[PDB]
Amino acid sequence: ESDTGLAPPALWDLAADKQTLQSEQPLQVARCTKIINADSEDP
Amino acid sequence: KQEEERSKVDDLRGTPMSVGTLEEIIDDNHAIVSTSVGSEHYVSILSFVDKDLLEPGCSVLLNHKVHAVIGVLMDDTDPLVTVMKVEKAPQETYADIGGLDNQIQEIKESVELPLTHPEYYEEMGIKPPKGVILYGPPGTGKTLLAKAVANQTSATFLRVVGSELIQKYLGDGPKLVRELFRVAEEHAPSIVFIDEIDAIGTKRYDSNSGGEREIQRTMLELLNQLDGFDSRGDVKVIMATNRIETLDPALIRPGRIDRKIEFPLPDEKTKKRIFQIHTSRMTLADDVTLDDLIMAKDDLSGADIKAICTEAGLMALRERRMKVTNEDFKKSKENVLYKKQEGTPEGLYL
Amino acid sequence: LREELQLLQEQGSYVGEVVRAMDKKKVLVKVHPEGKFVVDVDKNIDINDV
Numbered sequence: 205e206s207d208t209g210l211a212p213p214a215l216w217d218l219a220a221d222k223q224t225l226q227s228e229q230p231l232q233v234a235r236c237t238k239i240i241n242a243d244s245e246d247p
Numbered sequence: 248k249q250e251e252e253r254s255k256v257d258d259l260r261g262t263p264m265s266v267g268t269l270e271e272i273i274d275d276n277h278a279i280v281s282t283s284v285g286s287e288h289y290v291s292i293l294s295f296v297d298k299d300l301l302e303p304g305c306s307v308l309l310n311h312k313v314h315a316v317i318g319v320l321m322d323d324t325d326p327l328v329t330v331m332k333v334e335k336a337p338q339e340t341y342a343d344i345g346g347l348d349n350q351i352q353e354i355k356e357s358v359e360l361p362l363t364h365p366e367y368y369e370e371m372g373i374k375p376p377k378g379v380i381l382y383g384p385p386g387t388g389k390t391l392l393a394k395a396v397a398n399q400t401s402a403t404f405l406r407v408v409g410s411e412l413i414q415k416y417l418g419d420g421p422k423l424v425r426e427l428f429r430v431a432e433e434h435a436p437s438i439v440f441i442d443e444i445d446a447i448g449t450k451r452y453d454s455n456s457g458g459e460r461e462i463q464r465t466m467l468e469l470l471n472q473l474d475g476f477d478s479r480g481d482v483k484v485i486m487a488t489n490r491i492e493t494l495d496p497a498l499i500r501p502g503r504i505d506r507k508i509e510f511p512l513p514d515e516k517t518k519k520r521i522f523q524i525h526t527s528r529m530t531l532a533d534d535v536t537l538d539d540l541i542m543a544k545d546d547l548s549g550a551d552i553k554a555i556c557t558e559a560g561l562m563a564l565r566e567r568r569m570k571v572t573n574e575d576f577k578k579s580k581e582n583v584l585y586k587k588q589e590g591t592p593e594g595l596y597l
Numbered sequence: 598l599r600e601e602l603q604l605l606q607e608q609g610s611y612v613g614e615v616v617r618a619m620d621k622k623k624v625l626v627k628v629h630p631e632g633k634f635v636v637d638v639d640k641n642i643d644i645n646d647v
Binding site: 282320324 | 633634637
């Protein structure tokens, strides 16, 4: 068997019905980078 | 038919699950992870993921749409903290070695005395030493002496070769140092034995490339957690290399290691035991004369003696016999021992 | 001739070397240019492919 991050349902059972659907299509995905430099009065 | 809510979440996530890398954890239901190509993503984390085992350095499960943390993944069979622990017993206790009894009381007072009789220290309020360095000519008695002391102990023992700490995943190096020293702290006051430490510590060079910095940070964190000074619980560390001059100087200076044991040369006294020890587990016939082999050759180690006994066993099997005669030993003494005999000022010094 | 032409008009496949994997109809496949992947087994084969 495996785990894959499970738990007994008493704390995530109410979390797993409609909150997952609101963390997909509204919630986007961003990335991290570094900033080299900048400019003045305009980005 | 009863298990429903777990079955839905087995079906809620995406099917082609990828494998991610924890970097940093922010406790606001989202964090920063790392993909396999070093691309990193501001993604989120679910609620059923059992946020108790999330450590920076652990592996997780990611998606393709939003790449959020699907679920935490286990170590996936990475036995890098459990295999190096010696479970069974090593070789013979003290009668295997011979002629090194100058050096026995040093290690016996440094390891056995702080554990078995910690009262001599408390009569005068003097701390035991932490580290012990074993250097000398290569293959002299260093590995044989460490197994000799580790056999006579009443605590757990670690066997570290040194090359099984060096990996390339940019965290795995100094993590396993913390994971071992946590195992040594939580368990019995084990004996850390990290052999070949000259591969990780020498002369402290810093380059701009990314091939050398993975050694220096692992070395630096080792000296940090050796001298963490929070709760070590009397963990005895034994370090050993062949040479000593091309090593790290701040590990030599006191506060770190105060025992620098040297393992000098030989003689024709200690040899005769090793001849008897190596010629014990064989069909040694009653026609062999080892004393002529002992007196004649005057510079050899036990690894030479082992190479004699094996070549003696091979010559007996080439002539389709079980037992070994003296002649197989004579030829093996004349064959194998001619590889290094070079350089002597004979007849000059009485 | 039509059989080979329909299968030709098809996006190809990958390859992953697996030494071991977990149970519950999900295996750990690692491709060559990228990392590890926890994927699904197919129903036309067995689960026992470790």
